[PDB]
Ligand binder design. Structure first.
Ligand SMILES: CCCCCCCCCC(=O)OC[C@H](COP(=O)([O-])OCCN)OC(=O)CCCCCCCCC
Lengths: 613, 95, 75, 60
């Protein structure tokens, strides 16, 4: 009565040919969970094979097989068996029952003591590149990621094996963490995730009211709101930040409404682990800890837009103070560089050099502190952490040249000149303090830069080839004597000073003239192609939110103060009671809106009378 | 009864100016039954012309809070017409 | 070559009008640095002109002006 | 570009490799075909109506 007979009978669903299993299993002193009955080396047992194929969502061979397993006296229950291989490990029969969309089969296996909390920590179930489907490796989370309400409802309210809605996996994720973790920006997936996130939250309100499901963290220490912020999932991010529920499911809401007066409404959004008072807030995670193209999209959404606007309006005085200090430092640095000696006035110049050294050391120490605090931010996003790099570079140059002034060498003046030039190019950072120049500064490094690099590559190839050509062709006599000189003469065609003459001094002069004309034609092809491609990229246009992301990065660095003094940090919003959960006091942000179409006074309000900020 | 508080005056910050009159309050709420009852009740009849502290009437107040949005504009236009047709047969002596 | 701020600004402004002098001056102790610095100025100047052109095209293509003229007529 | 590179150079002819795997798709007696593995993710198709060749997931 070999294993292939079992795996052929259970592939057909016939219960009559299961006769002879109990008698042979008792006679041979074997077990149905043994490796002899295992389907191959993958680890698959007989019941998972019977579950894997079904006749109209039900099998007549599952319950007799479970009866045989019960009558066989197995020390280890077969319904709790796991595959235990390299790729497909921990996958139990309850997971397959949930997969095949058979609620009746799930009920049939859970009636006989199937363990609900079975982690499937195989390679297929872990999130990695290649082939995988991560869902939190739990049957509760598997039903939560399948868009099934009956199965999760039965699992959470069954009397035999109740399913705890909070349950850590090997990565530390819960069912909410797993539901956040697999999410797209697509309308089909986002509606699924949002609706059943709400459903699981409202279920946990009346199933486990003692614990707070939202205020839980994984092994990385992130709540599902912070997990959505870090992973770039914006569709659930807005819904979590903006959810309002009317009725008994009130405390698990974040967009409370304080008062209404005709068309004007004052509503309080929640700032729980959102404002910068927390060490790992959502704003810091979005600005610094998130590697996703949807970063600027996550900044201009309420209530983050108005909160960051308030923070910028409070810190703009320090922003312009830093601007004025940097401008004064560059004025002093320009005056001293203008009055350099040949390589009262001497004492003043020495004091100026001392001030330059002090400012350079200050800038270097501040930039080194920033790089120590934000070491991963460079690898995450180069286009948001490059001025600081420049603010490092010239700064050490500002030190380095002075060192070459101490040694009294030749090269202290070119380093000072490059420091001056890079310092004046570093003044464009503070142009993000105004809206028009802030939108202007986005285009100067984002879209034009890649086109300029590819254009420079092609132009440098053409320039070098043509320069070698005119150098080699002009040596024979009847202009161009070196590669640098010929490249300088050929580069002047782009600036309007290209010399084009019929030189009657070379043995091959018509060839040189034709070659110059060909260079002019191909150069105009390159410039025209760059212009057309950049127009085409621009006309198919975002930049406003990218500027707002630069504003959010700017203010979050300013709330940390300078490297030498740590400023006091202030809480945003007010601590107000939102309900009797005994009081439920939350820190909240006041947002005012005007709606001329919402004329229904159905939802309750926290305050009966209007009040000011 | 004029409600000339700071909340009811038009200024920056938090406010909702509506002409500080119950007639004008009903006119700025998009309610026809309440204004119809107020303008034709025998106990305390409501004069459709009534100056406030800023000098605005109900028509001035209804013009004063208006957007270019389709929801507010239809409200203001339709009930401006309604108040004008009511004042035609309620106070025909004055313009 | 460059002796004052006004003269050097006049020489550097001529690159936008097509008269920017770009030569390897064999009279200065630091001449390759000056040549590289001139090339960097030319590159950043072309960045600025190109950015202005692109931004103004982008503002124009997302276009009003007929009514503004009529307002000037009414005034 | 790639189709010219699969022919190799003019002096040496490179070996040419089959893409995909030879797998049975049905009993037409077996019907074995050379096929290409394509993976897709669909969050809207939640109906298990069509049959599948393999009952268990497998890697490339
Ligand atoms: C004697 C010791 C004194 C120590 C305290 C000096 C006062 C603090 C100067 C200061 O505010 O530095 C900030 C300024 C801008 O850097 P950033 O944070 O914007 O960096 C942004 C990078 N993205 O950085 C600078 O401007 C550096 C200038 C150093 C000289 C300051 C002269 C002040 C004259 C009134």
């Amino acid at each position: 009565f070999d294993r292939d007979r079992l795996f052929s009978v259970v592939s057909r669903g016939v219960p009559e040919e299961l006769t002879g299993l109990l008698e042979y299993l008792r006679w041979n002193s074997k077990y149905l969970t043994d490796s002899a009955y295992t389907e191959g080396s993958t680890g698959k047992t007989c019941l998972m094979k019977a579950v894997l194929n079904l006749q109209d969502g039900v099998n007549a061979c599952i319950m007799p097989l479970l009866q045989i397993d019960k009558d066989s006296g197995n020390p280890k229950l077969l319904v709790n068996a796991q595959c235990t291989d390299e790729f497909y490990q921990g996958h139990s029969a309850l997971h397959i029952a949930i997969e095949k969309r058979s609620l009746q089969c799930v009920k049939l296996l859970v009636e006989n003591g199937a363990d609900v909390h079975l982690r499937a920590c195989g390679r297929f179930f872990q999130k990695h590149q290649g082939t995988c489907f991560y869902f939190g490796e739990l049957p509760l989370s598997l039903a939560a990621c399948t868009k099934q309400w009956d199965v999760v409802t039965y699992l959470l309210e069954n009397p035999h094996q109740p399913a705890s809605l909070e349950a850590t996996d090997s990565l530390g994720n819960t069912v909410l963490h797993a539901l956040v973790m697999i999410a797209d920006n697509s309308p089909e997936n986002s509606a699924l995730v949002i609706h059943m996130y709400d459903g699981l939250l409202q279920m946990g309100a009346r199933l486990c009211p003692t614990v707070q499901l939202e205020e839980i963290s994984n092994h990385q220490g992130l709540t599902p709101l912070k997990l959505a912020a870090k992973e770039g999932k914006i569709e659930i991010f807005r819904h979590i930040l903006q959810r309002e529920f009317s009725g008994p499911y009130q405390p698990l809401s974040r967009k409370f409404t304080e008062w209404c007066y005709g068309p004007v409404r004052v509503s309080l959004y929640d700032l729980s682990s959102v404002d910068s008072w927390e060490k790992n807030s959502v704003l810091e995670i979005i600005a610094f800890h998130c590697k996703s193209p949807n970063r600027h999209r996550m900044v201009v959404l309420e209530p983050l837009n108005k909160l960051l606007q308030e923070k910028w309006d409070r810190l703009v005085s320090r922003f312009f103070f830093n601007f004025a200090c940097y401008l004064v430092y560059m004025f002093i640095f320009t005056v001293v560089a203008y009055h350099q000696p040949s390589l009262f006035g001497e004492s003043m110049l020495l004091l100026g050099h001392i001030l330059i050294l002090l400012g350079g050391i200050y800038l270097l120490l501040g930039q080194l502190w920033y790089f120590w605090r934000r070491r991963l931010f460079i690898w995450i996003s180069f286009m948001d952490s490059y001025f600081e790099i420049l603010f490092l570079l010239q700064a050490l140059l500002t030190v380095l040249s002075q060192v070459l002034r101490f040694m009294e060498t030749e090269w202290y003046l070119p380093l000072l000149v490059l420091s001056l030039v890079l310092g004046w190019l570093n003044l464009l950072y503070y142009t993000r303090g105004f809206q028009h120049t802030g939108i202007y500064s986005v285009m100067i490094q984002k879209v034009i830069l890649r086109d300029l690099l590819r254009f420079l590559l092609v132009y440098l190839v053409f320039l070098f080839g043509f320069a070698v050509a005119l150098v080699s062709l002009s040596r024979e006599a009847r202009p161009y004597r070196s590669i640098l000189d010929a490249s300088l003469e050929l580069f002047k065609f782009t600036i309007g000073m290209g010399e084009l003459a019929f030189q009657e001094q070379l043995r091959f002069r018509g060839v040189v003239l034709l070659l110059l004309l060909a260079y002019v034609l191909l150069t105009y092809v390159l410039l025209l192609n760059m212009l057309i491609a950049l127009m085409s990229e621009t006309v198919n246009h975002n930049s406003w939110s990218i500027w707002k992301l630069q504003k959010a990065i700017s203010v979050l660095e300013m709330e940390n103060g300078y490297w030498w003094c740590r400023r006091k940090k202030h809480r945003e919003g007010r601590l107000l009671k939102v309900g009797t959960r005994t009081p439920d006091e939350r820190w909240c942000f006041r947002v005012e809106e005007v709606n001329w179409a919402a004329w229904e006074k159905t939802l309750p309000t926290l305050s009966e009378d209007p009040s000011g900020p």
